[PDB]
Design a protein around this ligand. Structure first.
Ligand SMILES: CCCCCCCCCCCCCCCCCC(=O)OC[C@H](COP(=O)([O-])OCC[N+](C)(C)C)OC(=O)CCCCCCCCCCCCCCCCC
Ligand SMILES: CCCCCCCCCCCCCCCCCC(=O)OC[C@H](COP(=O)([O-])OCC[N+](C)(C)C)OC(=O)CCCCCCCCCCCCCCCCC
Ligand SMILES: CCCCCCCCCCCCCCCCCC(=O)OC[C@H](COP(=O)([O-])OCC[N+](C)(C)C)OC(=O)CCCCCCCCCCCCCCCCC
Ligand SMILES: CCCCCCCCCCCCCCCCCC(=O)OC[C@H](COP(=O)(O)OCCN)OC(=O)CCCCCCCCCCCCCCCCC
Ligand SMILES: CCCCCCCCCCCCCCCCCC(=O)OC[C@H](COP(=O)(O)OCCN)OC(=O)CCCCCCCCCCCCCCCCC
Ligand SMILES: CCCCCCCCCCCCCCCCCC(=O)OC[C@H](COP(=O)(O)OCCN)OC(=O)CCCCCCCCCCCCCCCCC
Ligand SMILES: CCCCCCCCCCCCCCCCCC(=O)OC[C@H](COP(=O)(O)OCCN)OC(=O)CCCCCCCCCCCCCCCCC
Ligand SMILES: CCCCCCCCCCC1=C(C)C(=O)C(OC)=C(OC)C1=O
Ligand code: SF4
Ligand code: SF4
Ligand code: SF4
Lengths: 97, 80, 70, 104, 318, 156, 176, 360
């Protein structure tokens, strides 16, 4: 049965965020719990992920930092928190981080 | 009558199914062998009380007890 | 994906499960661990009122069997 | 009795919801806003009258699930098919004399 | 103890109506190749709460009403009828076990057009009244086939008792002897609740739903939640009426789980019909009633009168 | 004290409810209608934010002015704005709704819709992309999130 | 070289007539449409997770404007007014004088972003790559005059976005 | 129920476009044409480009003509998606709107990859196109076109055989061929009434005499045959796009007259003549010889015309914009008589109406 593979993928998504605390952290900040390959992290704390098995548009994403330039951005994440060196990679203007 | 029937079945099949179902509902209970049993089952359903008879001396068909042989029976209903 | 609609459907399903389960448990609590008596016809109500009068506690659901006769 | 209690409870909850939905948005004081026969159709009245007459025919049809229990089944089946046939004949006369037109 | 049972009926009705808006927006999202709400709560679960709190603190719109009394009584009547349609529903036990629950629900649903009519009177616009009269004529049109299909099905039940309709379907679903009645029933209940493809008030083919029209209307949340109570109720009634489940009298929860799953599937079928078809024109659904459904309904009514007589399958009264 | 805490949490509740259930009325006047329709298309999908597509204009929260406001439709714009229940917000989408745009020197164009209605968010572009309009909608939500209606009510 | 949409006469034999009557009475095309909607129910939706995911863009994208510099800090604009000569909205306003070392530079360089039609004629008219149109599209304001950019705002956008602007020009200058 | 008189009042998006054109150069007046039929951007660009090139007595290079025909059919897919999906969404079918706008989103990505704007590209210019295709664009156009037939198929599954969609469009908006010719109708408004007419066949422009496509012809003049004509035009646009992707030639993309088209930025910064010509094209612009032309193309809404008058200078004197939606919305009053108020929104759907080109 292939439903068991789906449930094991869900549980390893729970495990890949460091347990239930990180799972609920990304569930309530990002509304998206899937795990990816950490491409890098900028000087603010924005973390950038890949999953090339996702479709084009989902395959690169950012988890925003909780504090950028003094503002608490735990819930107040912003599209313009991405620095310009990662803005080419996140908007897919290049294949190169 | 075969051209008209196929034409009305091509143009207005809802009305053809309507008149066919209605015509079956009309002519079918007079042709069915179980229409007798509907009457037989409705007259055998005991709503009232079976008010007994004073035994005058000559009633050979009327039983004296419910489990007696004579009287109306519903073995046809148990079996069908 | 499509299994994201299942939490809302599950919450709505629990909300539809509560009324029927609730009325079944309340009918068994209010009637001596049994089903509520259904009296659609006046004979059923007559037998039910006779049960209420023979139970001695003004409750139709207190059943009196052969221990009540000599 | 329990029916009357339930009707009173449903009416009370409905009136409570209506009273809340009219008086709760009056809590926030808003900026007081200071800026700034119908045509008859015969078909609208005719569909309502056609409803009323077929609804009376339905009122005749409603005791049928009790009427099948009778011992006079041939008369009962005749009059049942006759009421449904007269409803169908009312519908056919409503059809063919242009009564079901532009609200077909 | 009885008031506990009344409240555990009517408060989960309102909670199910709340989350039906979420289920609608999600299932219509995924059928439209997008998502529904997933930001406001985890998987969108706070969207009904946020939306209800938003609607309850929003200003009464602009205008004034022609009749204050009917402007008040139309949502009261709509919510009261939408809550009283649930009390004879045998799931497996009705709250108010009555001998005539079917006829009760048919009569209380016939009373539901006065909310539409009084909200048309209470608006000041003479065009909103015309839209209300079109809606009233639609609903009273499909009540005819509701009544006759319901009668034709109850000829196999024996009575107007809704709880007997569980006993009637112990050997087979009643959709097997009466599937044309079942599909015309389902489409007629769809056309009852002003539900797409029959929603002419909430859509086009409408003289007044036309962007920057007048007509002071009531608080939208009350009519909306009355309408979704009616949608869930008519799907539960279709589930009881045609797809009646197994009932163990020692385990009522089996019947409650089974009718709940079927009623959820049937309400999702309403959601899946509204996201699949364009709308009827008004005379097209008048056509669909008066020239299409009503002839088949009268023919199948003759059939279901004469059929237990010819098959010797007349159901018992009790 | 205690009352400041209570009115602060009630501001948080009502601001959460109002920003997370925005219902937009769209003046789709011109080309920016196409890009709002892409902001409701399945890629960006306004409806997952609580922002329903084709909301009723009678019960809408934000009026998205998406297109060129001409002189001939300025009173209809103001009439639809006056028929909106408070709290009402206005997102001005695109260059012609912001400041006249490419038709700034025209005889027949209102030089920005802010001559007609108060504007909360100005979304720049010709057209701004559907992602840029969704950015402006989220900035409107952040603007609602820092409202202080009951705190200012308590301090008056 | 032409085809007739909807010029089909249907077959009138009993097979096809019964086919069309079964389609009418049993709602076969309606179940087909329900099946297609059900088919999209079980697809992965096309929804990206904005703002945590971004829509795809090319290096040609025309967003927020910026005034650039040479790799010395010297600003590239030599006040030639080709960009306001070509600006179809007349969004650009330029004044100029020789600055304190005798160099031809601007004193005013205004771009009204609410007149601007974002067509990139200024960046293709500019002979020194000074005015470009960057990748920033996430710059919605709350007041109208915050979109009336002077020279200091455009030079700050250039200093802010040069690390990205220079790479996009590096990717696209051979097509220009 | 009946509609006796239908009087559309327009000018609610009248911006005085073709007076603003008179005070701008030809390159400056080009982006006004993206904003006319704003679901048909590069087609109106192509019409204005052909008008200015017909006045300038110059011609685009072959690769520019194949890029124009490729992106004109991509534009036609955009506009017929918009037409069919809003025509269904107003009647009530809301789901294929959301289905086809993801494909429409991908074609806006094609526009952004080729120009930098998702809608108003200003790409097709007098002299050719502005800029060459970036590498790997044609492969992604292939990957789009390879799958788009299934998208049209499932749209057509949702609407075409549907009885509710047919009952809203089959006896609605019947236009006779003689009234369609007399009322100035064009495009699908003619071809749904059985008129065998298409400007890509009869008066062929850039390389439409080299691609190979069929022209769908209706039979009853109704909303339903015009729906089928638009769906089959999407099919045939996919066919033309396959032929354009296979027959793309090498070469330059502007006319190599640098007194009309600008030189490259590499040679503008090296050659003196190239810098002078860049200067005078981006400030004065190219002068057009005096004359008046009526250049018309087959836009996805119908015949889109430009009556452009030049006075010898570098600005247009008069530029009348003939648009299909103007004549179609003039014919709305005839097309709705004896119908109902619900049929009027289907008639405004079958006349593909966008009020930018109705109003200018
Ligand atoms: C149960 C179903 C859901 C029901 C709704 C959800 C529960 C919350 C109900 C209360 C919501 C908060 C109070 C009402 C909204 C107030 C918003 C607002 O703008 O207030 C400004 C208003 C007025 O503020 P103002 O004086 O600044 O007026 C602003 C307008 N001008 C200046 C033009 C006059 O505040 C109030 O009137 C205060 C109301 C009471 C505060 C809360 C007390 C407890 C309530 C329980
Ligand atoms: C038009 C005529 C339709 C009715 C045809 C006869 C139906 C029938 O079964 O009638 C028997 C029924 C009932 O007969 P029955 O045989 O059931 O009577 C047995 C006695 N009871 C009723 C107590 C069980 O009616 C009659 O016999 C008399 C009433 C109808 C008389 C004819 C009316 C003609 C109207 C013309 C205008
Ligand atoms: C309870 C659970 C759900 C039940 C099933 C329902 C789920 C499926 C829902 C699908 C989506 C439907 C959305 C709304 C659709 C509304 C439009 C529509 O369907 O219109 C109905 C259409 C209307 O017709 P029409 O408009 O398509 O066709 C043209 C009509 N004229 C010619 C008048 C212009 O068809 C019907 O009215 C059929 C109603 C039910 C038919 C029942 C058939 C019984 C057959 C018996 C045997 C017949 C053989 C011959 C006799 C033999 C005798 C032995
Ligand atoms: C005998 C048993 C009892 C019979 C009575 C009970 C009937 C129950 C069904 C109720 C029907 C109510 C409405 C009836 C109206 C009849 C008139 C009618 O509809 O005529 C018009 C119709 C053409 O339709 P039109 O007017 O064009 O509709 C607009 C869309 N085109 O014209 C037609 O389509 C032609 C209609 C007449 C021919 C129909 C033939 C059907 C045959 C079915 C098989 C035989 C069944 C037995 C009955 C005898 C039938 C001859
Ligand atoms: C029959 C079944 C019916 C079911 C109905 C309900 C369905 C949905 C169930 C809930 C699903 C999960 C909800 C989670 C909501 C968000 C909770 C949360 O943590 O929100 C964060 C917010 C701010 O927290 P902050 O302190 O800023 O955190 C910064 C961290 N450094 O913190 C806050 O805002 C404060 C905490 C708010 C918590 C709200 C929880 C949900 C309340 C819903 C009302 C109904 C509750 C259930 C009633 C019926 C059952 C008993
Ligand atoms: C604008 C005004 C306000 C509008 C909102 C509120 C009013 C509208 C909604 C409420 C409608 C109330 C309907 C109540 C009666 C329904 C019929 C009924 O009683 O059926 C149930 C049952 C019949 O079943 P059966 O089993 O045969 O009888 C019991 C014997 N074993 O019979 C019983 O169980 C009988 C129980 C005793 C009799 C109950 C009588 C109820 C009180 C009088 C009527 C109240 C409503 C008046 C106003 C109606 C609307 C204007
Ligand atoms: C004396 C003490 C009490 C004083 C009075 C207060 C009474 C309790 C009122 C509810 C709690 C107050 C605080 C409300 C939320 C405040 C915090 C907040 O807004 O956190 C934001 C967080 C989501 O973050 P966000 O900004 O949306 O980011 C976008 C996604 N990255 O948001 C979240 O995570 C979700 C926030 C959910 C809000 C709470 C749950 C809804 C309210 C339930 C109770 C009221 C309604 C009851 C039912 C009504 C009918 C359905
Ligand atoms: C008591 C709970 C109240 C919940 C209110 C939710 C209202 C529905 C939100 C979305 C919506 C839907 C689905 C909807 O169908 C509709 O009608 C077209 C709306 O009005 C414009 C809507 O806003
Ligand atoms: S700002 Fe520009 S692209 Fe947007 S609607 Fe106006 S003219 Fe069209
Ligand atoms: S992009 Fe166009 S409108 Fe904007 S400043 Fe440059 S030339 Fe002017
Ligand atoms: S075209 Fe370039 S160098 Fe010339 S004035 Fe404009 S920005 Fe400056």
């Amino acid at each position: 049965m292939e439903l068991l593979q789906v449930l094991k993928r869900g549980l390893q998504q729970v495990s890949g965020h460091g347990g239930l605390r990180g799972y609920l952290r990304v569930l309530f900040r990002a509304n998206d719990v899937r795990v990816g390959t950490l491409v890098g992290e900028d000087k603010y704390g924005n973390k950038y992920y890949e999953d090339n098995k996702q479709f084009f548009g989902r395959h690169r994403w950012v988890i925003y930092t909780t504090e950028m330039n003094g503002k608490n951005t735990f819930w107040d994440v912003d599209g313009s928190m991405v620095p310009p060196e990662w803005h080419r990679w996140l908007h897919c203007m290049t294949d190169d981080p | 009558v075969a051209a008209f029937l196929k034409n009305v079945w091509a143009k207005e099949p809802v009305l053809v199914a309507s008149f066919a179902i209605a015509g079956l509902a009309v002519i079918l209970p007079t042709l069915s062998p179980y229409t007798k049993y509907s009457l037989m089952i409705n007259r055998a359903t005991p709503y009232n009380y079976p008010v007994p008879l004073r035994d005058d001396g000559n009633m050979p068909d009327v039983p004296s007890h419910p489990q007696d042989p004579q009287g109306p029976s519903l073995e046809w209903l148990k079996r069908l | 994906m499509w299994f994201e609609v299942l939490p809302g459907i599950a919450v709505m399903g629990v909300c539809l499960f509560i009324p029927g389960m609730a009325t079944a448990r309340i009918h068994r609590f209010s009637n001596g661990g049994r089903e509520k008596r259904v009296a659609h016809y006046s004979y059923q109500w007559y037998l039910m009122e006779r049960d209420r009068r023979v139970s001695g506690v003004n409750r139709y659901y207190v059943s009196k069997g052969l221990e009540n006769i000599d | 009795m329990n029916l009357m209690i339930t009707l009173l409870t449903n009416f009370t909850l409905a009136t409570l919801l209506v009273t809340i939905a009219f008086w709760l948005p009056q809590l926030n004081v808003y900026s007081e806003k200071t800026s700034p026969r119908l045509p008859f159709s015969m078909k609208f009245f005719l569909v309502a009258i056609t409803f009323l007459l077929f609804d009376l025919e339905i009122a005749l049809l409603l005791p049928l699930p009790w009427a099948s229990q009778t011992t006079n089944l041939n008369t009962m089946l005749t009059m049942a098919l006759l009421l449904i046939f007269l409803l169908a004949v009312s519908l056919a006369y409503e059809w063919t004399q242009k009564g079901l037109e532009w609200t077909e | 103890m009885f008031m506990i049972n009344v409240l555990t009926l009517i408060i989960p009705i309102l909670l199910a109506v709340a989350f039906l808006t979420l289920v609608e927006r999600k299932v219509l999202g995924y059928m439209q190749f997008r998502k529904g709400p997933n930001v406001v709560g985890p998987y969108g679960l706070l969207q009904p709460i946020a939306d209800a709190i938003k609607l309850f603190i929003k200003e009464p719109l602009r205008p004034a009403t022609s009749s204050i009394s009917m402007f008040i009584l139309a949502p009261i009547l709509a919510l009261t009828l939408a809550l009283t349609m649930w009390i004879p529903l045998p799931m497996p036990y009705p709250l108010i076990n009555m001998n005539l629950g079917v006829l009760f629900m048919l009569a209380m649903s016939s009373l539901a057009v006065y909310s539409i009519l009084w909200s048309g009177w209470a608006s000041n616009s003479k065009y909103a009244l015309i839209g209300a009269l079109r809606a009233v004529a639609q609903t009273i049109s499909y009540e005819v086939t509701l009544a006759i299909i319901l009668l034709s099905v109850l000829l196999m039940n024996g009575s107007f008792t809704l709880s007997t309709l569980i006993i009637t379907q112990e050997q087979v679903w009643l959709i097997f002897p009466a599937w044309p009645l079942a599909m015309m029933w389902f489409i007629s209940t769809l056309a009852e609740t002003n539900r797409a493809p029959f929603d002419l008030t909430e859509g086009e083919s409408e003289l007044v739903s036309g962007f920057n029209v007048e007509y002071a209307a009531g608080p939208f949340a009350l009519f909306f939640m009355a309408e979704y109570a009616n949608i869930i109720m008519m799907n539960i009634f279709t589930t009881t009426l045609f797809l009646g489940a197994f009932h163990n009298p020692y385990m009522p929860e089996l019947y409650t789980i089974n009718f709940t799953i079927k009623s959820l599937l049937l309400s999702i079928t309403f959601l899946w019909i509204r996201a699949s078809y364009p709308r009827f024109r008004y005379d097209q659904l008048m056509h669909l009633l008066w020239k299409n459904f009503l002839p088949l309904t009268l023919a199948l009514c003759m059939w279901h009168v004469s059929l237990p007589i010819l098959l010797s399958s007349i159901p018992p009264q009790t | 004290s205690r009352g400041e805490y209570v009115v602060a949490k009630l501001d948080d509740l009502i601001n959460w409810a109002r920003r997370s259930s925005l219902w937009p009325m769209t003046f789709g006047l011109a080309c920016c209608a196409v890009e709002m329709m892409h902001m409701a298309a399945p890629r960006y999908d306004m409806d997952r934010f609580g922002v329903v597509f084709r909301a009723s204009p009678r019960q809408s929260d934000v009026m998205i002015v998406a297109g060129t406001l001409t002189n001939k439709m300025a009173p209809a714009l103001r009439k639809v704005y006056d028929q909106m229940p408070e709290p009402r917000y206005v997102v001005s989408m695109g260059s012609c709704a912001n400041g006249g745009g490419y038709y700034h020197y025209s005889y027949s164009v209102v030089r920005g819709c802010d001559r007609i209605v108060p504007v909360d968010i100005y979304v720049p572009g010709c057209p701004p992309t559907a992602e840029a309009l969704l950015y402006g909608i989220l900035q409107l939500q952040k603007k609602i999130k820092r409202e202080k209606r009951l705190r200012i009510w308590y301090r008056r | 070289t032409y085809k007739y949409v909807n010029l089909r006469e249907p077959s009138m034999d009993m097979k096809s007539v019964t086919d069309r009557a079964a389609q009418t009475l049993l709602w076969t095309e309606l179940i087909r449409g329900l099946g297609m909607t059900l088919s999209y129910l079980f697809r992965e939706p096309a929804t990206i997770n904005y703002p945590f995911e971004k829509g795809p863009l090319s290096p040609r994208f025309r967003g927020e404007h910026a005034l650039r510099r040479y790799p010395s800090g010297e600003e590239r604009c030599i006040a030639c007014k080709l960009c306001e000569a070509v600006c179809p909205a007349q969004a650009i306003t330029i004044e100029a004088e020789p600055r304190a070392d005798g160099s031809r530079r601007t004193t005013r360089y205004d771009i009204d972003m609410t007149k601007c039609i974002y067509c990139g004629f200024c960046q293709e008219a500019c002979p020194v790559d000074a005015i470009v149109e960057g990748p920033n599209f996430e710059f919605s304001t709350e007041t109208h005059e915050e979109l009336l950019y002077n020279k200091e705002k455009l030079l700050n956008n250039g200093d802010k976005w040069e690390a990205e602007i220079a790479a996009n020009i590096q990717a696209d200058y051979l097509y220009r | 129920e009946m509609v006796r008189k239908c009087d559309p009042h327009i000018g609610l998006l009248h911006r005085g476009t073709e007076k603003l054109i008179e005070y701008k150069t030809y390159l400056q007046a080009l982006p006004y044409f993206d904003r006319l039929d704003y679901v048909s951007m590069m087609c109106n660009e192509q019409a204005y480009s052909l008008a200015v090139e017909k006045l300038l007595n110059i011609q685009p290079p072959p690769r520019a003509q194949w890029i124009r025909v490729l992106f004109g059919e991509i534009t036609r897919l955009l506009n017929h998606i918009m037409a069919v999906t809003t025509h269904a969404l107003d009647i009530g079918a809301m789901t294929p709107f959301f289905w086809m706008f993801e494909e429409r989103e991908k074609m806006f990505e094609f526009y952004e990859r080729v120009s930098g704007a998702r809608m108003h590209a200003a790409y097709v210019r007098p002299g050719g196109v502005h800029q060459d295709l970036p590498l790997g664009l044609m492969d992604d156009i292939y990957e789009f076109s390879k799958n788009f037939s299934l998208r049209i198929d499932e749209l057509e599954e949702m609407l075409t055989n549907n009885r509710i969609w047919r009952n809203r469009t089959v006896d609605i908006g019947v236009v006779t061929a003689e009234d369609a010719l007399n009322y100035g109708f064009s495009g699908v408004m003619l071809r749904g009434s059985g008129i065998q007419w298409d400007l890509r066949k009869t008066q062929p422009y850039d390389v439409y005499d080299q691609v190979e496509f069929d022209v769908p012809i209706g039979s009853r003049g109704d909303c339903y045959d015009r729906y089928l004509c638009r769906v089959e035009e999407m099919r045939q646009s996919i066919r033309i796009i396959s032929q354009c992707l296979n027959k793309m030639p090498p070469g330059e993309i502007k006319v190599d007259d640098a007194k009309v088209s600008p030189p490259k930025r590499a040679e503008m910064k090296t050659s003196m003549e190239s810098l002078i010509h860049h200067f005078k094209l981006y400030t004065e612009g190219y002068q057009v010889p005096p004359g008046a032309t009526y250049t018309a193309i087959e836009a996805p809404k119908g015949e889109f015309g430009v009556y452009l008058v030049s006075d010898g200078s570098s600005r247009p004197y008069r530029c009348k914009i003939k648009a299909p939606g103007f004549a179609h919305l003039a014919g709305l009053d005839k097309m709705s008589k004896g119908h109902m108020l619900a049929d009027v929104v289907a008639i405004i759907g079958t006349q593909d109406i966008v009020f930018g080109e109705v109003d200018r």
